[PDB]
Amino acid sequence: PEQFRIRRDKRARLLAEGYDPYPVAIERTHTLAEIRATYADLPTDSATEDIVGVAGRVVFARNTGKLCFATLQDGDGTQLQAMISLDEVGRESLDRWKADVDIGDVVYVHGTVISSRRGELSVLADSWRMAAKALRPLPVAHKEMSEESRVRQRYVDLIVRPQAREVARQRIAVIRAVRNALERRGFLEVETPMLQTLAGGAAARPFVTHSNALDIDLYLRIAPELFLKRCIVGGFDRVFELNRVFRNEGSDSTHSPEFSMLETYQTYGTYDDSALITRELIQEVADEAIGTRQLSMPDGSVYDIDGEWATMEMYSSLSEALGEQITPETTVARLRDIASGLDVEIDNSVFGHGKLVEELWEHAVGNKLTAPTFVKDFPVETTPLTRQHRSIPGVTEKWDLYVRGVELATGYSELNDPVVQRDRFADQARAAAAGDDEAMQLDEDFLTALEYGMPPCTGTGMGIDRLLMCLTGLSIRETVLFPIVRP
Ligand SMILES: C[C@H]1CCC[C@H](C[C@H]2Cc3cc(O)cc(O)c3C(=O)O2)O1
Ligand SMILES: N[C@@H](CCCC[NH3+])C(=O)O
């Protein structure tokens, strides 16, 4: 702040002396990574006759009599030494280096490539220019930034913390690997709308906004599911969308109101076929983007995601954990007595057979899972868009995938019968009459699309930020460049 005034004074002084502190048209001949790669076998204390013009952020500096040193860091983190010698740039230019250049400044250095006496790959400057005067100093070390500071100023965090650049790179690589795995399998990527006149496809409160052009309220999508199914009616055979959804709910280490998700749809497959593809995709993504299926976690542990994953049924695994047979016919009263006997808090929101079964399963089974696990065959009350089971009464052909304790993905045999789907919406209407404001509202145009005939298909959904959390052990806020902060 005292430091801010000083740097601002320098900026103005340069502009008034004719030395442009934010010049345009600087040509950079090599990145620093290019210099380090080309000259990796340069002998110590030797010089070349190759002239280069590099640019980079000054992150370290040393001053002596006729010779100043500075460590430049390119945007990717690669570092190279710049040497400002009296006998090379001249009295007038060297003095300007000492008085004008500060830590954090972006500078351009033109000179010849050498290796210093200490074996440091360097550019021996014959000239230099300010490229971008910095008015604020960098933190002395990334340890000095709180976690909230990293989120509020990711642009500083990327400069000073190598792990921040590495997570950003992993995110980009994971998403590219996801698309590669789906392209190998013949899936096509489409765009469906983000502003919707009715937001369905999941159970969540929407963000609401007023349209000036249409003169009505619109909703940000909570899922692309109902529009991807219209694509299936229209003839897309294998289709996906990897992009943002928006849910107007709470924030914690596994939930962000704005997040990235993948949804896939495949005709003439069931939830058994999408469980197989989802496992292989995750494992291929690990290979391509992380380099291993034995995942290093931040606490030093190794998490094995290789091989085939366990599968279990919700009702039967719950029954085993409790020592009592739970079925679709178990009463709401019985389920509440079981919960209270296990000291399970049941929010005044959670009611109905289906929600009570899921709650008990999460407490007695789900929270105790370590290895990657599919749980399948869900209560029909909580799965309005899922086809009923081909042979077992009262359940639907859905699975959830848990990896490292995180709910990562889900897959359905899709409900394509338009009459039954209309019945499912009526059951949601009764739930919403009982006070559930997450219940789905009936979408008449979606039903109209089903009434033209949707081929049988299987769909999946996967949280992309959650995928990265599972691969790295990070929380959802560490995997996004710019998570939302209250101003
Ligand atoms: C697209 C779906 C399919 C099932 C797994 C996963 C659940 C999903 C829930 C969810 C809800 C929410 O309000 C905020 C969030 O960040 C997430 C999330 O990351 O993941 O993503
Ligand atoms: N729409 C689902 C993901 C796809 C479900 C399978 N059709 C969700 O948001 O949870």
From TrEMBL:
Mg(2+) 2 binds at residue 407. Its EC number is 6.1.1.6. SUPFAM superfamilies: Class II aaRS and biotin synthetases, Nucleic acid-binding proteins. Binds 3 Mg(2+) ions per subunit. It is an enzyme of class 6 (ligase). It is found in: Cytoplasm. Its cofactor is Mg(2+). It holds the Pfam family tRNA-synt_2. PROSITE patterns: AA_TRNA_LIGASE_II. GO terms for biological process: lysyl-tRNA aminoacylation. Mg(2+) 1 binds at residues 400, 407. One of its GO terms (cellular component) is cytosol. Homodimer. This is Lysine--tRNA ligase. It comes from Mycobacterium ulcerans (strain Agy99). The lineage of its organism: Bacteria, Bacillati, Actinomycetota, Actinomycetes, Mycobacteriales. The gene is lysS.
